[PDB]
Copies of this chain bind each other. A is one copy, B any other.
Amino acid sequence: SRRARIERRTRESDIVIELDLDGTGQVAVDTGVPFYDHMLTALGSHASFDLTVRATGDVEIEAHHTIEDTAIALGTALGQALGDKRGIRRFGDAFIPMDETLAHAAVDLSGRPYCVHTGEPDHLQHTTIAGSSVPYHTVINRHVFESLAANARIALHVRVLYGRDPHHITEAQYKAVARALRQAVEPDPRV
């Protein structure tokens, strides 16, 4: 049983995470930031987690605090669910082609906490993905990966090899992290 429930209540937000590493992609995410819900739904589904995320926070300011608190809580849940990390593959990686974009992620689950994020085009440091609700500033992508790695206590390297569309570039990164995690958490039949 590799499950964790994390509640995180801060001045800025209130987060509940329920995570099972050995899931079938039963995922429900509601953070008040719909593009971020899309990304975390992709992360949970492609990782073959079962994942519920419920977050409410100070989106009148902008999505940053809620996004960051959610990534800290999710990181914490992943570290807790992994437990002693005995008998797992430990390392995982995945390439995600998405139209013109190619992204990659590599993880070491028993590595020191560390994040390296490279290759994202410079326009993503000031791009907004905006719909009818609270928008998503792509400059936060790096912050999400850094917060996940710091709180799960894993080494997580995310690369954009190339790409143009900010939705493709962002979604391919979340999916690459997800499939890298899926590989790394699997039981290793030789260990």
Residues of chain A whose beta carbon lies under 8 Å from any beta carbon of chain B? 24-25, 34-35, 37-38, 48, 58-64, 91, 93-100, 102, 106-108, 111-114, 116, 118, 123, 125-137, 139-140, 142-143, 146-147, 150, 155-157, 159, 161-162, 164-167, 179, 182, 190-191
Contact = CB atoms under 8 A, between A and B. Distances in A.
A168 B146 CA distance: 14
- Most chain B Cβ neighbours within 10 Å, of A24, A123, A125, A156: A125
Contacts of A146: 99, 114
Contact of A96 (B25, B35, B91): B91
Nearest to A139: B165
A147 B63 CA distance: 28
Contacts of A150: 112-113, 150
9 contacts: A48-B191, A64-B129, A91-B179, A96-B108, A97-B157, A102-B157, A113-B113, A113-B150, A128-B128
The DSSP consensus for interface residues of chain A is mixed
Nearest to A143: B165
A107 B97 contact: yes
Given A48-B190, A64-B167, A94-B91, A143 B99 contact: yes
A149 B62 CA distance: 28
Contacts of A62: 35, 129-131, 135-136, 167
- Top 10 nearest A-B pairs (CB, nearest first) are A95-B106, A62-B131, A34-B60, A97-B155, A93-B95, A97-B157, A48-B190, A123-B126, A60-B133, A99-B114
